[PDB]
Design goal:
This is part of a larger assembly, with nine protein chains of nine kinds. By secondary structure, chain C is mainly alpha-helical. Chain C is built from six helices and two strands. In chain C, helix 1 runs antiparallel to helix 2 (26-45). Helices cover 77% and strands 0% of the residues of chain F. Classes of the chains: A mainly alpha, B mainly alpha, C mainly alpha, D mainly alpha, E mainly alpha, F mainly alpha, G mainly alpha, H mainly alpha, I mainly alpha. The complex binds cardiolipin (4 copies) and 1,2-Distearoyl-sn-glycerophosphoethanolamine (4 copies). Chain A: It is a multi-pass membrane protein.
Chain lengths: 98, 347, 169, 171, 104, 140, 80, 105, 96
């Protein structure tokens, strides 16, 4: 198929493996999650413009709106975590081992 | 929380699950999962303690990762099929991604690693919603995509779920972690029979929802979250120890109780398809589940652990808690095995 | 060279994702996602998605990454071997992919991909006095009634949800 | 699969309308009024055959009728037409509203010398009917034989023989 | 193409003026001047999230000048007034539960 | 790692000993790499050297189990001249069990691994004989 | 109801103007005589090509030429 | 649990965005409208098991319309043979493939 | 004022659209002969190029149907120079 689809899929896998490998922060995890959303947006848009399927032109906007509301919800969870522990470090979220 | 806002948020959870159930378009499936997650986050943060914020954060991360993999599977479906119908998937990579995403949304092993943490972190009512109502939408999608699910993948996920949910509860004393590992093992039972007969999947789902709803309602009616706090139930309300006894002996798959019905019908539909080793290992691994259930019954009903002196004040007060459908859910979770061919209503 | 412009922007897109996914800090991670959103917007604009690329710049980069940098400023102090090593690992893997698909005009990472530029797959017609993508987005109100109902309800519920869970009571 | 069957280069040679888009836009309404019938035969052949290789003679009749249209303009009303399309050609969006006096000159000379009436608002957008002599295309999508459907259910629904037949449940 | 030339020209002029503003006052070698978490507000985050969600509702509202050209005007007018009504209901709920307070 | 099992099982029993030994060694080494990857996944080692030490230790342990399993089974199939016989894989399974007891530095773990892994390898041989399906394709 | 309306117009005139303008926007297109002409102009805007019909022999309402009398007309739009 | 409420109540909630051959705004066809219509009218009602084997040809034509893999492979072959013949000096491009021929209309 | 002027602008838009309607048959005939010219040129050059390749059918359609498929951008402008390629394939997008 098209060559750009390989690159957008590989960008999704890069932000996947970044989201699937935490370093220290939770904000870096949310940035990798929204990079995954960005690659979904681009790849869906290239398919829909590529096929001239008219009605699905409203699909990437709905993807954007729902996952940005999801991003706001995750930022609110991050705010509550950082207010509890002082930092957004994921190693402070460890009380559920016992 | 405001009771009006609580009712509107619970209707939004139910509405997201219904939007996954009824819709024919993949974007509406993804919208239904987004609505479900977005509305169930405040139910987990009802009490506003740091364990609920931790549990809601871990739940958010896992369900968000699953929702992004789900939309990636939908996008590769639009690549290789040019359409959006919720049916079989037209690519094995999209099938693998969607099976992983739905296994993460269920919390099946090896993506099980959020379920006991999030279940312990949140209250018993929100844990009841998480372990019963949230299993409806991904099993609906798995019911809808079963002509394209890879068999080796779903059976690997199922046996890994059953074994890990068996060995998980053997080390536990907290009741919510026990119910969560029970959930992992029972979702393994449900998806092991999916590509053979999904009517038995729906049967196992309904019987498991009834039994888990019974156990969480008993835990809310006794306000017990540990094994050792559940132990004092014989000195407070002795009928509750009988009910947790019959319900835990049901959930282990012991005849003549109706928790034997799902796994027996699953073995009955897997031996038809010339699989003998796999339901044998499933049935033998269910003894671990039954072992920590028997641990709970020894601690609660079959023996009498020592109580304290302040129990004498609680002798003077009745249960004012709304034990909603607890006799109904108790009778359905134990005495339903003579009505076993009622499973044809799920065909 | 100029016929490969969407491919060049997609390679810049992957390089930016390898950049912020290495995660040096959420500050520079946000900057890398901003640069990546800009070049992916360029990718969208070069197929004819003018409204959707301006939706990138106006909604994604315009509100959401603003809220991410706003929260990064407010919930993190003001600013390695592993970061730069994983960065050069991702850069070498992506340039080896580029080298393979430019020397063979064919590659198979997971699926098979053509090595020519993606100008080949375009249509040879016109859309008249309208844009097809603009009229499909205008169809959100006439044809997309239920989609508007569930999206507006999810946003209303989202306002309710954030006001409940950030209250702390 | 099959070799695609293209027409030759001699099947595609026709005397072109080598005028600009503002020239075509200036006499567009008189072109729609006067060159109605072969244009509509062509667009009906084009939406029914769904193949431009089945439409070459109709396109050649379109080109011949357009050439005769502009030759009939050029012999009688060349200078008001040139005055009109130059003023149409000046504008970037090529507005009709900017050039109403040159339009009045051109329409006046055309009605006086050629008898052509410029159509009213609404007329060129009408769905007309076309009398063709070619047969209707029996399968323009070249659709092959459809698969036969699964057999439907029939008969009165009798009870289940000896109940559920589930191991020992006699009902 | 002309847009890309214009963007590169604007970026080049901006970068050239930044280079002048940092390097031209480094010509005149001056003296060597040797002499010698943050507090969190919830209201800043709530105004940022309220902006984000209202901007998403704006993202729904932006194709209205194109939506007015439709043939299904009863449905289009209904869903247009319904989206602006849900934006107003979000604003009213943001009002009454003390969300717009001390940054009103 | 499916083609590893393909290039293991297709070879007749008691014919080519070094190739079967290396095929089972590769199967064991791949499974040990999987166990090592999950062990360094869920549990963080104290450094890089301790992590690659645990990785190499588990990988060589499972590779030695696979090597001595395939070697003992092929030598037993040669000295007994019964190629489609589960006692050969029973002796191979007990040899792999004694190997695991040697690697884990304990005798009772070796005896239990002898018994259970020998019965497991016998069951795998009988599944190869009668065609037993663990991931059975849906037919009804 | 008029004392409260004067009270809220004295206290909060911005919100009174807001709810009044929004109320007119809700209820007024159902009462306007020109709401019909919005539909009639939007459906009579020719974005596509008017693909003609094969003349079978009995279509008296479909014209054969644009300047024929029968067919849909836009005299109402020229006049209003 | 596909509770088909849209067919029970007779509402069109999401059937319209489902396929490319549905009713589009201003009658815009997709790039593979005919192929998708042929595959859908092939596979309608016969079930998915019979559609995997009895509608293979329409589905392969429709997938090759969507992704254009055989088309781009054939164009790669023609262009690679062309560049190889320019490399060998056995071919020269015609004036209608060099930009010196004053295009048709 | 906006009522009178937008009604007049809708009338002018309908006039412009009818000019487009009246011109579309000539432009459609030109477009048909355009794409058939370019495909016949590509076919004759495929015949004069693909002779050294063993087992090459010139003009073999990759679709099993014998229906006319709309020509792709690479099918028309694949053998032509990159200037005409860019002028056809990004010319409208890059136009100002
Ligand atoms: C169909 C599926 C139905 C599923 C269950 C629906 C009800 C439960 C969910 C909502 C709920 O909790 O409602 C309260 C609920 C009582 O549950 P509860 O509070 O846990 O019970 C504790 C005490 O009973 C509470 O006692 P009380 O002192 O507060 O008042 C007594 C109350 C007084 O009742 C009233 O006041 C009702 C009068 C108004 C009725 C509605 C008018 C509108 O009567 C009862 O509660 C008697 C028990 C009612 C039956 C409970 C079980 C329902 C069916 C469950 C499924 C059975 C499936 C069997 C299948 C077997 C084979 C597989 O139901 C009612 O009060 C109304 C019962 C109506 C039964 C209709 C049956 C036919 C439906 C078709
Ligand atoms: C053929 C290639 C492909 C086959 C399939 C892929 C291979 C996987 C096979 C099945 C899975 C086996 C288990 C893998 C993970 C191991 C557990 C682990 O992480 O332990 C570390 C850790 C234990 O560390 P610890 O708590 O610190 O205490 C240990 C001490 O530090 C110090 O303790 P230590 O120094 O004594 O060593 C500890 C460790 C080290 O283990 C070893 O050294 C044993 C190595 C294997 C020995 C036997 C090899 C036999 C090979 C086959 C025979 C060769 C010839 C074959 C010929 C044909 C057949 C006859 O041992 C264990 O952890 C034992 C418990 C786990 C059971 C292992 C069962 C192995 C089955 C292999 C089948 C082949 O446990 C955890 O992290 C538990 C949490 C995670 C549990 C979930 C794991 C899920 C794994 C899923 C794998 C499959 C993915 C499916 C993908 C598709 C669906 C999504
Ligand atoms: C499986 C083969 C055994 C491998 C696991 C051994 C136990 C874990 C271990 O290594 O602990 C050491 C080590 C630390 O343990 P420890 O400190 O020694 O704790 C033991 C105490 O000190 C206590 O002191 P101890 O070490 O002296 O006593 C330990 C005792 C040693 O026992 C003795 O010394 C006395 C008894 C002699 C041996 C047992 C004989 C039983 C015979 C079979 C049963 C009767 C059959 C009758 C047949 C009649 C007809 C012929 O061994 C056991 O209890 C192990 C029993 C077998 C384990 C697997 C059971 C599967 C059951 C499935 C359902 C049935 O564990 C670790 O570091 C964890 C990871 C170890 C590495 C991975 C293990 C290899 C896995 C290979 C893949 C297996 C896949 C599954 C195949 C079978 C199921 C389908
Ligand atoms: C004109 C209009 C008026 C006409 C009037 C006509 C009727 C006049 C009499 C009025 C009363 C009618 C009562 C029902 C009809 C007779 C049903 C019957 O006996 O079926 C024989 C049935 C099969 O034997 P059969 O010789 O082949 O059939 C003779 C007839 O053809 C049986 O007919 P069939 O072939 O059509 O039977 C169909 C099928 C035949 O059965 C089968 O195909 C076999 C499968 C049956 C279920 C097996 C499940 C096994 C696993 C779970 C075990 C659970 C634990 C066992 C009990 C623990 C303690 C509670 O039945 C079932 O599958 C139904 C499920 C079992 C319920 C049986 C009816 C109970 C009604 C009273 C309930 C009171 C509580 C009883 C205890 C609860 C457990 C039953 O026997 C059993 O299944 C044995 C279990 C006990 C049955 C209950 C006996 C009914 C009377 C009990 C009075 C004493 C209650 C003491 C207090 C409560 C307990 C502490
Ligand atoms: C054989 C070679 C294996 C090399 C990869 C595993 C190395 C390892 O365990 O690294 C430890 C590391 C945890 O980081 P650590 O070194 O403890 O932190 C100190 C801060 N510099 O752990 C990690 O970084 C976790 C991920 C390491 C890679 C696991 C998967 C690949 C290795 C197994 C299959 C091969
Ligand atoms: C045999 C042998 O030497 O076993 C010893 C071993 C413990 O070894 P250790 O002596 O500690 O050095 O002991 C073990 O490894 C544990 C037992 C080994 C297997 C014994 C098999 C027979 C057991 C009795 C079966 C009765 C029925
Ligand atoms: C207690 C646990 C008991 C387990 C008993 C399992 C019995 C064997 C079942 C799988 C097996 O080996 O089947 C035989 C089969 C080779 O025979 P055949 O079916 O002809 O292979 C062609 C396949 N298309 O081979 C296969 O299908 C593939 C080989 C499977 C080997 C399973 C064990 C591998 C090592 C552990 C993991
Ligand atoms: C049905 C029509 C469409 C309705 C939906 C669309 C509305 C569009 C405008 C968007 C408005 C969004 C925000 C609305 C919030 C309302 C709640 C509110 O503000 O209550 C508080 C306010 C008193 O303000 P306070 O708390 O003191 O704040 C300090 C500021 N000095 O309380 C008040 O001042 C009382 C406010 C309510 C009374 C206003 C009445 C206006 C009546 C005008 C004539 C009738 C209009 C037709 C509609 C019927 C209205 C009942």
């Amino acid at each position: 198929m098209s060559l750009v689809y390989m690159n957008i899929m590989m960008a999704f896998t890069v932000s996947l493996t970044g989201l699937l490998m935490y370093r220290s922060h939770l904000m870096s995890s949310l940035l990798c999650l929204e990079g995954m959303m960005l690659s979904l947006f681009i790849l869906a848009t290239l398919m829909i413009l590529n096929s001239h399927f008219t009605l699905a032109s409203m699909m990437p906007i709905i993807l954007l709106v729902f996952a940005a509301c999801e991003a706001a919800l995750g930022l609110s969870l991050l705010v509550m975590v950082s207010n509890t522990y002082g930092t957004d470090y994921v190693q402070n979220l460890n009380l559920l081992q016992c | 929380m405001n009771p009006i806002i609580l009712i509107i948020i619970l209707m939004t959870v139910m509405l997201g699950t219904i939007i996954v159930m009824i819709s024919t378009h993949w974007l509406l499936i993804w919208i239904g999962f987004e609505m479900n997650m977005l509305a169930i986050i405040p139910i987990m943060m009802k009490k506003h303690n740091p364990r609920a914020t931790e549990a809601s954060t871990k739940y958010f991360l896992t369900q968000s990762t699953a929702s992004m993999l789900l939309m990636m599977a939908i996008i590769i479906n639009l690549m290789f099929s040019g359409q959006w119908t919720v049916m079989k998937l037209f690519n094995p990579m999209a099938s693998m991604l969607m099976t992983m995403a739905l296994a993460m949304k269920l919390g099946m092993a090896p993506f099980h690693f959020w379920v006991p943490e999030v279940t312990q972190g949140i209250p018993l009512s929100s844990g009841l919603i998480l372990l019963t109502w949230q299993k409806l939408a991904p099993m609906s999608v798995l019911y809808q995509i079963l002509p394209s699910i890879n068999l080796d993948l779903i059976l690997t996920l199922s046996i890994l779920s059953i074994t890990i949910g068996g060995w998980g509860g053997l080390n536990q004393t907290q009741l919510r972690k026990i119910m969560a590992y029970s959930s992992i093992a029972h979702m393994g039972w449900m998806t092991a029979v999916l590509l053979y007969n999904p009517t038995m999947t729906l049967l196992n789902l309904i019987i498991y929802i009834i039994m888990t709803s019974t156990m969480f309602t008993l835990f809310m009616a006794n306000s017990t979250t540990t094994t050792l706090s559940l132990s004092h139930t014989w000195n407070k309300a002795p009928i509750m120890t009988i009910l947790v006894l019959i319900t835990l002996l049901s959930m282990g798959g012991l005849p003549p109780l109706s928790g034997f019905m799902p796994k027996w019908m699953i073995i009955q539909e897997m031996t038809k398809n010339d699989s003998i080793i796999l339901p044998t290992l499933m049935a033998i691994t269910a003894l671990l589940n039954l072992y920590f259930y028997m641990r709970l019954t020894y601690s609660t009903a079959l023996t009498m652990f020592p109580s304290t002196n302040n129990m004498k004040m609680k002798w003077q007060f009745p249960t004012t808690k709304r034990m909603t459908l607890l006799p109904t859910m108790t009778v359905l979770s134990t005495m339903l095995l003579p009505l076993t061919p009622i499973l044809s209503i799920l065909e | 060279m100029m016929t490969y412009i969407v491919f060049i922007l997609s390679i810049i897109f992957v390089m930016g994702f390898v950049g912020f996914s290495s995660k040096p800090s959420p500050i520079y991670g946000g900057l890398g996602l901003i640069v990546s959103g800009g070049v992916g917007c360029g990718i969208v604009l070069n197929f004819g998605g003018s409204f959707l690329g301006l939706m990138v710049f106006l909604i994604y980069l315009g509100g959401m990454m603003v809220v991410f940098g706003y929260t990064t400023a407010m919930a993190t102090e003001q600013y390695n071997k592993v970061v730069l090593g994983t960065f050069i690992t991702g850069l070498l893997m992506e340039f080896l992919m580029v080298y393979y698909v430019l020397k063979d005009k064919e590659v198979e990472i997971v699926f098979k991909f053509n090595g020519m530029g993606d100008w080949v797959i375009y249509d040879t017609g016109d859309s008249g006095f309208f844009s097809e993508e603009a009229m499909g987005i205008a169809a959100l109100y006439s044809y997309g009634t239920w989609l508007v109902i569930v999206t507006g309800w999810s946003l209303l519920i989202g306002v309710v949800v954030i006001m409940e869970i950030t209250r702390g009571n | 699969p099959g070799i695609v069957e293209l027409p030759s280069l001699e099947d595609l040679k026709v005397q072109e309308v080598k005028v600009s888009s503002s020239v075509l836009k200036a006499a567009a309404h008189h072109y729609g009024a006067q060159c109605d019938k072969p244009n509509k035969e062509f667009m009906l052949c084009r939406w029914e055959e769904k193949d431009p290789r089945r439409c070459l003679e109709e396109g050649k009749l379109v080109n011949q009728c357009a050439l005769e249209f502009f030759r009939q303009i050029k012999r009688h009303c060349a200078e008001p037409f040139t005055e009109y399309w130059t003023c149409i050609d000046y504008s970037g969006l090529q507005l009709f509203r900017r050039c109403r006096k040159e339009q009045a000159q051109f329409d006046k000379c055309v009605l006086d010398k050629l008898g052509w009436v410029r159509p009213d608002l609404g007329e060129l957008s009408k769905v007309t009917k076309v009398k063709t002599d070619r047969p209707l295309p029996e399968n323009p999508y070249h659709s092959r034989a459809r698969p036969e459907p699964n057999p439907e259910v029939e008969g009165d629904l009798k009870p289940a023989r000896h109940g559920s037949r589930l191991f020992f449940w006699t009902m | 193409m002309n847009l890309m030339i214009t963007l590169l020209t604007n970026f080049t002029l901006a970068t050239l003026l930044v280079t002048i503003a940092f390097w031209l006052p480094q010509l005149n070698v001056y003296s060597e001047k040797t002499s010698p978490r943050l507090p969190f507000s919830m209201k800043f985050f709530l105004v940022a999230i309220t902006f984000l969600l209202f901007d998403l509702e704006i993202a729904l509202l932006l194709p209205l000048p194109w939506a007015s050209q439709t043939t299904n005007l009863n449905t289009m007018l209904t869903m247009a007034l319904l989206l602006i009504f849900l934006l107003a209901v979000s604003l009213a709920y943001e009002w009454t539960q003390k969300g717009l307070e001390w940054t009103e | 790692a499916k083609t590893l099992l393909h290039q293991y099982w297709d070879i007749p029993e008691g014919t080519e000993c070094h190739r079967k030994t290396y095929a089972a060694t590769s199967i064991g080494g791949a499974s040990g790499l999987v166990v090592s990857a999950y062990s360094v996944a869920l549990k963080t080692p104290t450094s890089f050297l301790e992590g690659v030490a645990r990785t190499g230790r588990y990988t060589f342990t499972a590779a030695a189990i696979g090597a001595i399993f395939g070697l003992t089974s092929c030598i037993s199939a040669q000295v007994r001249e019964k190629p489609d016989d589960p006692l050969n894989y029973l002796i191979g399974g007990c040899a792999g069990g004694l190997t695991l007891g040697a690697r884990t530095r304990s005798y009772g773990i070796g005896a239990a691994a002898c018994a259970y892994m020998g019965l497991t390898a016998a069951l795998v041989k009988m599944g190869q004989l009668e065609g037993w399906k663990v991931f059975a394709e849906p037919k009804v | 109801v008029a004392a409260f309306l004067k009270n809220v117009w004295a206290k909060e005139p911005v919100l009174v103007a807001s709810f009044a303008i929004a109320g007119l926007a809700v209820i007024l297109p159902t009462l306007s005589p020109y709401t019909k002409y919005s539909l009639m102009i939007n459906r009579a805007t020719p974005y596509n090509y008017p693909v003609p019909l094969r003349d079978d022999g009995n279509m008296p309402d479909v014209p054969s030429h644009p300047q024929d009398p029968q067919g849909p007309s836009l005299e109402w739009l020229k006049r209003l | 649990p596909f509770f088909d409420v849209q067919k029970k109540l007779g509402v069109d909630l999401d059937h319209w965005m489902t396929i490319q051959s549905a009713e589009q705004p201003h009658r815009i066809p997709a790039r593979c409208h005919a192929f998708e219509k042929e595959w859908i009218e092939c596979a309608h009602g016969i079930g998915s098991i019979r559609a995997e084997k009895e509608c293979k040809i329409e589905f392969e034509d429709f997938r090759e319309c969507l992704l254009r893999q055989k088309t781009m492979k054939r164009l790669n072959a023609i262009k690679r043979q062309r560049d190889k013949l320019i490399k060998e000096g056995k071919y020269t491009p015609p004036p209608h493939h060099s930009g010196q021929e004053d295009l048709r209309p | 004022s906006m009522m009178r002027w937008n009604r007049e602008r809708r009338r002018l838009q309908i006039e412009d659209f009818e000019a487009r309607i009246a011109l579309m048959p000539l432009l459609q005939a030109e477009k048909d002969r355009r794409v058939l010219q370019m495909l016949r040129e590509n076919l004759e050059e495929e015949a004069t190029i693909m002779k050294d390749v063993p087992g090459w059918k010139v003009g073999e359609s990759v679709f099993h149907t014998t229906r006319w498929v709309t020509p792709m951008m690479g099918e028309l402008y694949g053998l032509r120079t990159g200037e005409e390629i860019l002028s056809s394939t990004y010319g409208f997008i890059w136009y100002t």
